Design an enzyme around this catalytic site. Structure first.
Site, PDB file in Angstrom:
ATOM      1  N   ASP A 108       0.785  -1.241   0.098  1.00  0.00           N
ATOM      2  CA  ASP A 108      -0.257  -0.147   0.063  1.00  0.00           C
ATOM      3  C   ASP A 108       0.801   1.306  -0.084  1.00  0.00           C
ATOM      4  O   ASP A 108       0.406   2.367   0.228  1.00  0.00           O
ATOM      5  CB  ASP A 108      -0.852  -0.229   1.150  1.00  0.00           C
ATOM      6  CG  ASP A 108      -0.133  -0.129   2.741  1.00  0.00           C
ATOM      7  OD1 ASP A 108       1.039   0.105   2.648  1.00  0.00           O
ATOM      8  OD2 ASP A 108      -0.875  -0.642   3.371  1.00  0.00           O
ATOM      9  N   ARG A 135       0.641   6.618   0.118  1.00  0.00           N
ATOM     10  CA  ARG A 135       0.136   5.740   1.029  1.00  0.00           C
ATOM     11  C   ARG A 135      -1.405   5.557   0.184  1.00  0.00           C
ATOM     12  O   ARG A 135      -2.174   6.629   0.193  1.00  0.00           O
ATOM     13  CB  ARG A 135       0.189   6.014   2.545  1.00  0.00           C
ATOM     14  CG  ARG A 135      -0.517   5.105   3.198  1.00  0.00           C
ATOM     15  CD  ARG A 135      -0.047   3.686   3.239  1.00  0.00           C
ATOM     16  NE  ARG A 135      -0.761   2.964   4.351  1.00  0.00           N
ATOM     17  CZ  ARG A 135      -1.830   2.352   4.626  1.00  0.00           C
ATOM     18  NH1 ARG A 135      -2.596   2.171   3.106  1.00  0.00           N
ATOM     19  NH2 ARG A 135      -2.344   1.662   5.425  1.00  0.00           N
ATOM     20  N   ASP A 147      -5.431  -1.116   3.963  1.00  0.00           N
ATOM     21  CA  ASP A 147      -4.507  -1.651   4.632  1.00  0.00           C
ATOM     22  C   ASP A 147      -3.875  -3.183   4.039  1.00  0.00           C
ATOM     23  O   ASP A 147      -4.627  -3.937   4.029  1.00  0.00           O
ATOM     24  CB  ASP A 147      -4.470  -1.910   6.030  1.00  0.00           C
ATOM     25  CG  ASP A 147      -3.170  -2.118   6.880  1.00  0.00           C
ATOM     26  OD1 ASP A 147      -2.200  -1.473   6.436  1.00  0.00           O
ATOM     27  OD2 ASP A 147      -3.296  -2.891   7.449  1.00  0.00           O
ATOM     28  N   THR A 148      -2.721  -3.053   3.285  1.00  0.00           N
ATOM     29  CA  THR A 148      -2.126  -4.447   2.948  1.00  0.00           C
ATOM     30  C   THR A 148      -1.454  -4.605   4.112  1.00  0.00           C
ATOM     31  O   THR A 148      -0.990  -4.006   5.015  1.00  0.00           O
ATOM     32  CB  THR A 148      -1.148  -4.075   1.630  1.00  0.00           C
ATOM     33  OG1 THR A 148      -0.320  -3.190   1.816  1.00  0.00           O
ATOM     34  CG2 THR A 148      -2.163  -3.813   0.381  1.00  0.00           C
ATOM     35  N   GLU A 152       1.808  -5.828   6.713  1.00  0.00           N
ATOM     36  CA  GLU A 152       2.699  -5.467   7.048  1.00  0.00           C
ATOM     37  C   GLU A 152       3.998  -6.312   6.590  1.00  0.00           C
ATOM     38  O   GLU A 152       4.067  -7.431   6.583  1.00  0.00           O
ATOM     39  CB  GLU A 152       2.917  -5.117   8.427  1.00  0.00           C
ATOM     40  CG  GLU A 152       4.250  -4.440   9.141  1.00  0.00           C
ATOM     41  CD  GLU A 152       4.553  -3.211   8.391  1.00  0.00           C
ATOM     42  OE1 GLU A 152       3.314  -2.618   8.370  1.00  0.00           O
ATOM     43  OE2 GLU A 152       5.365  -2.954   7.755  1.00  0.00           O
ATOM     44  N   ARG A 156       3.391  11.347   4.105  1.00  0.00           N
ATOM     45  CA  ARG A 156       3.102  10.437   2.719  1.00  0.00           C
ATOM     46  C   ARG A 156       1.707  10.982   2.065  1.00  0.00           C
ATOM     47  O   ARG A 156       0.622  11.227   2.798  1.00  0.00           O
ATOM     48  CB  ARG A 156       2.864   8.931   3.250  1.00  0.00           C
ATOM     49  CG  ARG A 156       3.995   8.183   3.854  1.00  0.00           C
ATOM     50  CD  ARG A 156       3.733   6.892   3.797  1.00  0.00           C
ATOM     51  NE  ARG A 156       2.686   6.740   4.871  1.00  0.00           N
ATOM     52  CZ  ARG A 156       2.276   5.649   5.636  1.00  0.00           C
ATOM     53  NH1 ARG A 156       2.898   4.423   5.471  1.00  0.00           N
ATOM     54  NH2 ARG A 156       1.404   5.492   6.395  1.00  0.00           N
TER      55      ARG A 156
HETATM   56  C1  THP Z   1      -4.252   5.183   5.135  1.00  0.00           C
HETATM   57  C2  THP Z   1      -4.015   6.095   6.080  1.00  0.00           C
HETATM   58  C3  THP Z   1      -2.907   6.001   7.034  1.00  0.00           C
HETATM   59  N1  THP Z   1      -2.603   6.668   8.042  1.00  0.00           N
HETATM   60  C4  THP Z   1      -1.620   6.528   9.163  1.00  0.00           C
HETATM   61  C5  THP Z   1      -2.487   5.566  10.110  1.00  0.00           C
HETATM   62  C6  THP Z   1      -1.689   4.503  10.937  1.00  0.00           C
HETATM   63  O1  THP Z   1      -1.036   5.391  11.913  1.00  0.00           O
HETATM   64  P1  THP Z   1       0.027   4.859  12.980  1.00  0.00           P
HETATM   65  O2  THP Z   1       1.307   4.172  12.426  1.00  0.00           O
HETATM   66  O3  THP Z   1       0.155   5.778  13.733  1.00  0.00           O
HETATM   67  O4  THP Z   1      -0.797   3.540  13.536  1.00  0.00           O
HETATM   68  C7  THP Z   1      -0.461   4.293   9.557  1.00  0.00           C
HETATM   69  C8  THP Z   1      -1.106   3.375   8.896  1.00  0.00           C
HETATM   70  O5  THP Z   1      -0.360   2.991   7.833  1.00  0.00           O
HETATM   71  P2  THP Z   1       0.926   1.755   7.649  1.00  0.00           P
HETATM   72  O6  THP Z   1      -0.331   0.694   7.206  1.00  0.00           O
HETATM   73  O7  THP Z   1       1.599   2.134   6.185  1.00  0.00           O
HETATM   74  O8  THP Z   1       1.697   1.598   8.538  1.00  0.00           O
HETATM   75  O9  THP Z   1      -0.669   5.609   8.742  1.00  0.00           O
HETATM   76  C9  THP Z   1      -3.252   7.897   8.004  1.00  0.00           C
HETATM   77  O10 THP Z   1      -2.864   8.742   8.958  1.00  0.00           O
HETATM   78  N2  THP Z   1      -4.185   8.299   7.194  1.00  0.00           N
HETATM   79  C10 THP Z   1      -4.449   7.312   6.275  1.00  0.00           C
HETATM   80  O11 THP Z   1      -5.536   7.722   5.566  1.00  0.00           O
HETATM   81 CA    CA Z   2      -0.133  -1.503   5.608  1.00  0.00          CA
END
Ligand code: THP
Ligand code: CA
Length: 137
Positions: free
Chosen positions: A17, A31, A36-37, A39, A83
């Site tokens: 993702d 992103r 969510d894909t 990890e 991102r």
């Molecule tokens: C998809 C998305 C993720 N995020 C944040 C939420 C999560 O924060 P936290 O890292 O603090 O949990 C993280 C998930 O992304 P990843 O799946 O790349 O880790 O990115 C946003 O803030 N907005 C969005 O629209």
């Molecule tokens: Ca992810």
């Protein structure tokens, strides 16, 4: 929503993702909105199941595209990690939806107002779950 004029070129797909793109002559990490894909990088979660599969899927789809387009939603365009937050299209097929339809991503991180395609994606997730695909197997 409207796609940004033209398209971006791929620099590197990092996992299912997250992809780095040359967007308007700037290298940018994007992103994918509303999904969510699994990890593959951060040690706290480890390499989650279907993480490798989701990554290969995103990589093939963007690598084989003639045109990569970026569509922002109505709210914030970058998250707290800097991102870009977008719907990414590979020859007019949304990567976000393609992943969800394959059971390779779950609909996640729905933050209003960035939810224009949420119902479209939830319908695809419903179909992947009733087909028991991959994450839903
Ligand atoms: C998809 C998305 C993720 N995020 C944040 C939420 C999560 O924060 P936290 O890292 O603090 O949990 C993280 C998930 O992304 P990843 O799946 O790349 O880790 O990115 C946003 O803030 N907005 C969005 O629209
Ligand atoms: Ca992810």
């Amino acid at each position: 929503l409207h796609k940004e004029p033209g398209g971006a070129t791929l620099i590197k797909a990092i996992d299912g993702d997250t992809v780095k793109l040359m967007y308007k002559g700037q290298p940018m990490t994007f992103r994918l909105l509303l999904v969510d894909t699994p990890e593959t990088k951060h040690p706290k979660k480890g390499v989650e199941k279907y993480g490798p599969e989701a990554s290969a899927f995103t990589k093939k789809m963007v690598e084989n595209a003639k045109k990569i387009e970026v569509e922002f939603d109505k709210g914030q365009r970058t998250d707290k990690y800097g991102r870009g937050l977008a719907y990414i299209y590979a020859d007019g097929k949304m990567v976000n939806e393609a992943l969800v339809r394959q059971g390779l991503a779950k609909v996640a991180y729905v933050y209003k107002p960035n939810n224009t395609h949420e119902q479209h994606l939830r319908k695809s997730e419903a179909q992947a779950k009733k087909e028991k695909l991959n994450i839903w197997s």
